[PDB]
Motif scaffolding. Structure first.
Motif, short mmCIF file in Angstrom:
data_model
loop_
_atom_site.label_atom_id
_atom_site.label_comp_id
_atom_site.label_asym_id
_atom_site.label_seq_id
_atom_site.Cartn_x
_atom_site.Cartn_y
_atom_site.Cartn_z
N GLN D 740 30.71 41.99 52.07
CA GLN D 740 30.34 41.46 50.76
C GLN D 740 29.70 42.54 49.89
O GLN D 740 29.99 42.63 48.69
CB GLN D 740 29.39 40.27 50.92
N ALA D 741 28.84 43.37 50.48
CA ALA D 741 28.26 44.48 49.74
C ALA D 741 29.34 45.45 49.28
O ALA D 741 29.28 45.96 48.16
CB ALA D 741 27.22 45.20 50.59
N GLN D 742 30.33 45.71 50.13
CA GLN D 742 31.43 46.58 49.74
C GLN D 742 32.20 45.99 48.57
O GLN D 742 32.58 46.72 47.64
CB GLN D 742 32.36 46.82 50.94
N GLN D 743 32.44 44.68 48.59
CA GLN D 743 33.12 44.03 47.47
C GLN D 743 32.31 44.18 46.18
O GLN D 743 32.87 44.51 45.12
CB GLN D 743 33.34 42.55 47.77
N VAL D 744 31.00 43.96 46.26
CA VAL D 744 30.16 44.07 45.06
C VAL D 744 30.19 45.49 44.51
O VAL D 744 30.27 45.70 43.30
CB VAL D 744 28.72 43.61 45.38
N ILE D 745 30.12 46.48 45.40
CA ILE D 745 30.16 47.88 44.96
C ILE D 745 31.50 48.18 44.29
O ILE D 745 31.55 48.84 43.25
CB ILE D 745 29.89 48.82 46.15
N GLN D 746 32.60 47.72 44.89
CA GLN D 746 33.91 47.96 44.30
C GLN D 746 34.03 47.32 42.92
O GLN D 746 34.70 47.87 42.04
CB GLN D 746 35.02 47.45 45.22
N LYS D 747 33.39 46.17 42.72
CA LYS D 747 33.43 45.52 41.41
C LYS D 747 32.60 46.26 40.36
O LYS D 747 32.69 45.91 39.18
CB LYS D 747 32.93 44.07 41.53
N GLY D 748 31.82 47.25 40.76
CA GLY D 748 30.99 48.00 39.83
C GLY D 748 29.55 47.50 39.83
O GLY D 748 29.19 46.53 40.50
N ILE D 749 28.73 48.20 39.06
CA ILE D 749 27.30 47.91 38.95
C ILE D 749 27.01 47.47 37.52
O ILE D 749 27.28 48.21 36.57
CB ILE D 749 26.44 49.12 39.33
N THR D 750 26.46 46.27 37.38
CA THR D 750 26.05 45.73 36.09
C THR D 750 24.55 45.92 35.91
O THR D 750 23.83 46.27 36.85
CB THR D 750 26.44 44.26 35.97
#
Lengths: 9, 79, 306, 1052
Positions: D740-750
């Motif tokens: 899940q952390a990998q998915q969030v990182i791939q989606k970028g940082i807001t």
């Protein structure tokens, strides 16, 4: 003893 | 008292519980015979304790010698 | 089977949701839980309380079937202890539950899969108590299981089987009651089939008693004794060559004519097993010249395929 | 997947010494010992047979019963028959108890019996005497309690009151009665004993009685059986049992068996390989089995184990009860034995007899070879089946006396020893049962046998015996079996495990037992252990060192032998052994060697000083248990030199001075127990008694290992275990969190501005660390360590570090974060400690291990995979503690005057980066030699390096930020910076996230600037912000200002 034990060398 | 009934435990116990359920008249005599059988069996009777206790609760059967025998058996103390 | 893991995960989730919390629904749920394979420890321990605290006979029976089927995966000391106490509760149920149907069903459910844990001393004592059950069929199954266990725990099985052989033989010899002798002979056949090692030394007395019964002046008893001598012929292994002549004489005497109450099917079967076991060939043809005529006449008379 | 990485991760500080508290297991009350051994010195045979005359009370049938002691009286005349029967009975009793004075009374008188009883009592006043009575030729005993005997002319039956009989007899005695109404005799005897007890105010238990029949019952008169039936059962159990078998309907199951064939049975009662001996052995085993199973333990020990004659009599008495039951006769014993006629073992007895005697027709006529009965093999098989699944403390197996009986012979001795050892491995209760059943003398006798195959089974069994009961050392020394164990230990071919068990046996033998100490000193044990000291086995080395230390425990002779053998010098190696258990054993040995100098020569003074100096350099030892044993050894040194140490202490208010400084270091120990013991030992010095000496429980703790089961599969290997399933569930959750952390990182940082919660702490938050997976955040204050949650939002626990006021908790870490995690607390002075059960509902704070390190604050960089631990600070050295061995492996020089403000390392590589207060950031590689460890040295800053963090990626980037607040991105393969940035003029703290390149900066003006490595502006959050931390997986940030407020941020 209570029981005779044989073949102990 | 004089024979061995460790073999026919079920053969005698099942008719006893059935008789207890089917006839309030013979509750005392059946319980006395069952208590004697328990005293003869000893620890081998631990199998039937749950079912018999269930029947006693179902019929409020409170026998002093049977109760003390079961208590001694569950305690493990022997006499 | 595109996603069998997902399919089973969904089913197990639904089963857990159903079982976490009427009567017919519970019956259906138990049938489903026992029907096919699954991936179950807390459920077993909970249903152990469930079938104890359920006064419904159908619910108890379905729970017993479900437990037996779910116990198929049978190293953890904790899990071995769990299976041991589960089996102990199963056995006390199979000995103490008044319902003969449920007792027979659980006892039957104790298959070869549970042999290892069944060989224990306490389980063997429970089986010994169970062998003297009111239901004769339950008695037969108990003696069959005990005989099958004569190899795993001979020290505890062989003496008890010898004593039960004593009681069966004296019951057959003395009890002048057809039904009792039927059950005695059937018990003897089961013991022969399941405990050949136990009965092999006692082949001479068992055969002598069977012979004396066979010479006495009900069809169930005679059919059972013929089955028993057939099984004993297999078990002895050429050790009964002395008695082949008398066995042949009596079997052919009852084989001729249909007035005899004994069945020609079991008679021919035991004759064949006797011949195969003791290797008695050609010599019966010479000694008894009507044997071929009788056997060929059966092909024209008898109608049963067996 | 990412599961294998979790699986192949060593669990540092998770072992027996860490989890289980160090202490000795309490020894249970061992009541298996025999209180006393009685002997039947004499036997009295009163035979009131009255041959040729029938008593008036009973009118016997014309055939009646004529066999008395297997002798027909009418055949050989009256007097000759009487004498012959007496001699035969004497022989029958001699079969069981040959060594006894037999005196026969044949139709005696009252005065004759009185004189005999008085003479026998005078011969044996305090020992058991057997009184045999056979009242077949006299009328039945009266209700008054009288026994009929003959006058001189044999014309009248003169009674004899039982009160007079027991008056002539003493208290220790046994009586056997063979008459129709022996129950009346027993009742009268008990009543007269009660009368004696009543009289005593203004000999019941000691007396033993055996009776043929109940008072009402009469002896059987069947012609087939002997008249002397009860005595025949008590004397010839095999003969009477075979005859009784040949009469039951069971004979129909074996045709061709007749009393004549039984009479011509071959074999003797002594040669067990013969049919008769085999039957006797089986009978003895079966009767002993029934007695043990039915009778309680106390009565069983009192009856079937006290003396040979009583044991044999009751073993035959069980058969007597079974045989007499079929004839309406109940034999009676003074100690009421519960009935044993229905016990299942009698069925086995019948089966074994039937199998054994079925070969007799071929043995006698054809002459076949006697094939041994499979009874013992089957029983041992049943015992094995019980052991297969007998782990639980269920009913004890019925075959323990069977194992005891089969131990006597050799045919199945090896298998019996194997199964017995397997049974003993179950636990202390199993060993206690094996001792109670009476296995000790026989397992002691096995030591005399020279068969080499017996050695491993014997040492395993004896090791278990000594682990449970330590009093066996006396008997082992008396039997001289320690020579057997010494020969076992002196065999290199023998497996190391059995050698270790033999060493343990010798250690417990010599444990505070002077006789064993000098016996083993005579036994070359010191040389043997020194020869087996460098074996590649940690357990063997530990127990050998423990035994060596125990041998010279207050034994100058052993100390001198070790001096000659240079045992101290040879043991110096084990102080550097990687295993802390072996190190502790060595330290204990050295301390015990020092403790027994007893004022020897100047050579002893010098060697003691040498050992003290060698033990002085173990102060910097990671293991606090080892340091505690160091305290114990130095306490031995103190008690040896109390006057000198007192003088040294008074000087401050050059050997003892250095030892005292070492003791000061041990006193100022992070471990509370070690510090307390050291402080007490030092306080004993100032006020200068023996009570100050304290002994650690390390030796008994190690001994407990053999008490615990060994053979069974370990729990961790178990595939279906709850613990393994729990670990798998945690690993599954960890994998999900990583994905899940990998998915969030791939989606970028807001932009991150959400505030989950705001709470206030009692103290300033110094350093914050997040648990990688569980939602627990550790915040360390000046005097406390708070453990908050960012999901529930509640205070869980409130710890106290225990460090002094001046010191401060600088850095923290979560050891074994994947599962079963710990907490690392490293103070700025050097005190490093480990916390367990820090955020659990049903458990309290627990301290696993602690040790002073070294000796900015303190900087730590834990590496889970390699397990190495490094501490850096004001010292110019970076130490590398290895948690596995608890030792310092490397001490790389920093080569810089300034303190190491920050430190980090790269996984899978040796790229130890150390920031410094002067500004320079050095890098060291431990793969090469120490002087070449330094690789690069670049200097582009002049300020304290706030955080010189390193990215876990292969292209490691050193993002160095100083108090000047300028960012410089160095690389380990380049001599110059790659990117240069200036963010904040005055920076107080900073934090970076490896997964997301977010450089979080603080500010005095409450600003919280979160930029990237390239320096792009992202967020400038508006509130001395001295603590920021980032989640290893989630993009979560916790910010703590000068005020004691804690917050957790999230990216939507």
């Amino acid at each position: 003893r209570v029981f005779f034990m044989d073949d102990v060398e | 008292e004089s024979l061995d009934f460790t073999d026919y435990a079920s053969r005698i116990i099942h008719p006893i519980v059935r008789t207890l359920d089917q006839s309030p008249e013979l509750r005392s005599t059946a319980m006395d015979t069952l208590s004697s059988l328990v005293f003869q069996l000893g620890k081998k009777y631990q199998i039937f304790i749950p079912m018999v206790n269930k029947v006693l609760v179902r019929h409020r059967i409170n026998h002093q010698r049977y109760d003390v025998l079961i208590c001694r058996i569950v305690k493990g103390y022997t006499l | 089977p595109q996603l069998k893991k997902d399919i089973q995960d969904g089913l197990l989730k639904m089963l857990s949701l159903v079982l976490m919390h009427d009567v017919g629904s519970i019956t259906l749920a138990l049938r489903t839980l026992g029907s096919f394979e699954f991936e179950l420890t807390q459920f077993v321990r909970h249903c152990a309380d469930h079938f104890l605290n359920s006064e419904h006979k159908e619910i108890r029976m379905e729970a017993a079937r479900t437990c037996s089927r779910l116990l198929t995966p049978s190293v953890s000391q904790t899990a071995v202890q769990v299976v041991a106490d589960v089996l102990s509760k199963l056995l006390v149920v199979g000995i103490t539950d008044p319902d003969p149907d449920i007792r027979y069903c659980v006892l039957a459910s104790l298959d070869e899969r549970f042999d290892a844990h069944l060989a224990q001393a306490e389980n063997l004592q429970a089986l010994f108590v169970a062998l003297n059950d009111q239901v004769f069929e339950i008695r037969e199954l108990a003696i069959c299981t005990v005989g099958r266990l004569s190899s795993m725990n001979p020290a505890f099985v062989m003496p008890f089987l010898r004593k039960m052989l004593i009681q069966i033989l004296t019951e057959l010899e003395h009890s002048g009651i057809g039904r009792i002798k039927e059950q005695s002979a059937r018990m003897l056949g089961h013991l022969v089939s399941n405990a050949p090692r136990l009965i092999r030394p006692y082949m001479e007395p068992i055969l002598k008693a069977l012979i004396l019964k066979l010479k006495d002046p009900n069809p169930g008893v005679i059919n059972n004794v013929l089955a028993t001598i057939g099984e004993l012929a297999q078990v002895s292994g050429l050790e009964m060559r002395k008695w082949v002549d008398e066995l042949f004489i009596i079997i052919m005497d009852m084989l001729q004519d249909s007035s005899l109450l004994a069945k020609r099917q079991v008679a021919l079967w035991t004759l064949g097993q006797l011949v195969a076991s003791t290797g008695y060939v050609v010599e019966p043809y010479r000694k008894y010249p009507t044997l071929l005529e009788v056997l060929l006449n059966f092909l024209k008379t008898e109608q049963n395929q067996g | 997947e990412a599961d294998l990485t979790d699986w192949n991760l060593p669990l540092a500080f998770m072992k027996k010494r860490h989890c289980e508290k160090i202490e000795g297991s309490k020894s249970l009350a061992q009541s298996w010992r025999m209180k006393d051994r009685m002997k039947t010195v004499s036997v009295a045979l009163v035979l009131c047979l009255n041959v040729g005359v029938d008593p008036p009370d009973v009118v016997k049938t014309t055939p009646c019963a004529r066999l008395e002691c297997w002798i027909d009286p009418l055949s050989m005349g009256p007097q000759k028959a009487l004498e012959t029967i007496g001699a035969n009975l004497q022989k029958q009793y001699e079969n069981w108890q040959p060594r006894a004075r037999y005196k026969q009374s044949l139709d005696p008188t009252v005065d004759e019996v009185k004189k005999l009883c008085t003479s026998l009592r005078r011969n044996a006043k305090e020992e058991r005497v057997l009184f045999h009575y056979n009242g077949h030729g006299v009328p039945r005993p009266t209700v008054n309690g009288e026994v009929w005997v003959f006058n001189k002319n044999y014309t009248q039956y003169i009674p004899l009151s039982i009160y007079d009989l027991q008056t002539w007899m003493g208290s220790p005695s046994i009586f056997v009665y063979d008459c129709s109404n022996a129950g009346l005799i027993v009742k009268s005897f008990k009543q007269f004993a009660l009368q004696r007890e009543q009289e005593l105010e203004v000999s019941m238990k000691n007396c033993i009685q055996l009776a043929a029949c109940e008072a009402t019952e009469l002896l059987p008169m069947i012609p087939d059986l002997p008249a002397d039936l009860f005595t025949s059962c008590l004397t010839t159990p095999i003969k009477i049992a075979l005859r009784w078998f040949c009469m039951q309907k069971c004979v129909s199951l074996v045709p061709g068996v007749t009393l004549d064939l039984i009479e011509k049975i071959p074999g003797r009662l002594n040669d067990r390989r013969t049919p008769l001996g085999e039957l006797n052995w089986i009978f003895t085993a079966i009767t002993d089995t029934i007695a043990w199973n039915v009778l309680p333990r106390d009565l069983f020990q009192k009856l079937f184990r006290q003396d040979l004659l009583v044991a044999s009599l009751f073993r035959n008495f069980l058969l007597a009860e079974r045989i007499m039951r079929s004839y309406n006769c109940t034999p009676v014993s003074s100690p009421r034995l519960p009935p044993t006629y229905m016990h299942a073992m009698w069925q086995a007895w019948d089966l074994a007899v039937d199998i054994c005697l079925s070969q007799l027709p071929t043995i006698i006529e054809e002459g076949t070879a006697f094939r041994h009965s499979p009874f013992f093999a089957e029983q041992l098989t049943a015992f094995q089946v019980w052991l297969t699944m007998g782990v639980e403390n269920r009913n004890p197996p019925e075959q323990l006396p069977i194992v005891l009986q089969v131990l006597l012979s050799q045919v199945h001795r090896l298998r019996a020893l194997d199964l017995l050892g397997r049974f003993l491995d179950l636990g202390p209760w199993a060993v206690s049962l094996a001792l109670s059943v009476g296995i000790f003398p026989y397992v002691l006798k096995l030591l005399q046998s020279s068969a080499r195959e017996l050695r491993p089974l014997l040492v395993f069994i004896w090791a278990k015996i000594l682990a449970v009961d330590s009093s066996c050392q006396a008997d082992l020394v008396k039997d001289n079996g320690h020579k057997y164990f010494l020969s076992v230990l002196a065999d290199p071919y023998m497996p190391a495990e059995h050698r270790t068990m033999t060493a343990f046996i010798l250690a417990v033998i010599v444990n505070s037992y002077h006789t064993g100490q000098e016996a083993c000193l005579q036994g070359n044990l010191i040389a043997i252990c020194l020869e087996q000291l460098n074996d590649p086995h940690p357990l063997l080395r530990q127990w050998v060192a423990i035994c060596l230390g125990r041998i010279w425990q207050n034994f100058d002779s052993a100390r001198w032998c070790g001096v000659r053998d240079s045992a101290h010098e040879k043991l110096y190696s084990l102080l550097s052994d990687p295993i802390p258990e072996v190190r502790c054993a060595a330290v204990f040995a050295l301390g015990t060697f020092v403790g027994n100098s007893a004022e020897r020569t100047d050579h002893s003074t010098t060697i003691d000083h040498n050992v003290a100096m060698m033990l002085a350099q173990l102060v910097s030892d990671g293991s606090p248990m080892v340091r505690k044993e160091l305290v114990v050894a130095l306490s031995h040194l103190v008690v040896q030199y109390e006057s000198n140490f007192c003088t040294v202490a008074l000087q401050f208010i050059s050997v003892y001075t250095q030892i005292w400084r070492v003791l000061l270091h041990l006193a100022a120990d992070p471990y509370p127990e070690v510090s307390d013991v050291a402080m007490k030992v030092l306080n004993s010095i100032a006020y200068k008694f023996i009570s100050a000496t304290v002994q650690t429980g390390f030796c008994d703790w190690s001994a407990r290992y053999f008490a615990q089961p060994v053979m069974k599969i370990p729990e961790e290997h178990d595939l279906e275990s709850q613990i393994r399933k729990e670990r798998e569930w945690r690993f599954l959750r960890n994998s999900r969190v990583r994905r899940q952390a990998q998915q969030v990182i791939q989606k970028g940082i807001t932009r991150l501005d959400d505030q989950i919660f705001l709470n206030r702490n009692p103290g300033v938050p110094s350093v914050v660390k997040f648990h990688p997976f569980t939602p627990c955040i550790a915040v360390a204050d000046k005097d406390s360590i708070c453990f908050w949650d960012w999901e529930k939002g509640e205070k869980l626990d409130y710890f106290h570090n225990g460090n002094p006021r001046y010191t401060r908790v600088t850095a923290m870490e979560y050891l074994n974060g994947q599962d079963c995690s710990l907490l690392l607390t490293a103070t700025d002075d050097g005190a490093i400690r480990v916390w367990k059960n820090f955020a659990d509902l049903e458990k309290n704070p627990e301290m696993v291990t602690a040790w002073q390190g070294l000796s900015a604050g303190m900087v730590v960089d834990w590496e889970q995979e390699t397990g190495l631990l490094m501490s850096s600070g004001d010292v110019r050295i970076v130490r590398i503690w290895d948690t596995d061995r608890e030792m310092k492996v490397q001490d790389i020089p920093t080569g810089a005057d300034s303190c190491v403000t920050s430190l980090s390392c790269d996984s899978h590589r040796s790229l130890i980066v150390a920031g410094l207060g002067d500004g320079s950031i050095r890098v060291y590689d431990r793969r090469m030699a120490l002087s070449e460890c330094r690789v690069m040295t670049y200097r582009e800053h002049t300020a304290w390096v706030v955080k010189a963090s390193l990215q876990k990626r292969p292209d490691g980037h050193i993002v160095s930020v100083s108090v000047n607040g300028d960012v410089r991105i160095f690389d380990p393969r380049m001599p110059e910076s790659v990117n240069v940035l200036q963010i904040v003029k005055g920076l107080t703290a900073l934090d970076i996230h490896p997964q997301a390149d977010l450089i979080a900066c603080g500010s005095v003006n409450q600003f919280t600037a979160i930029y990237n490595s390239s320096g792009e502006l992202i967020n400038n959050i508006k509130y001395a912000i001295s603590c920021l931390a980032f989640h290893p997986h989630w993009p979560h940030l916790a910010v703590g200002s000068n005020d004691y407020y804690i917050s957790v941020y999230s990216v939507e």
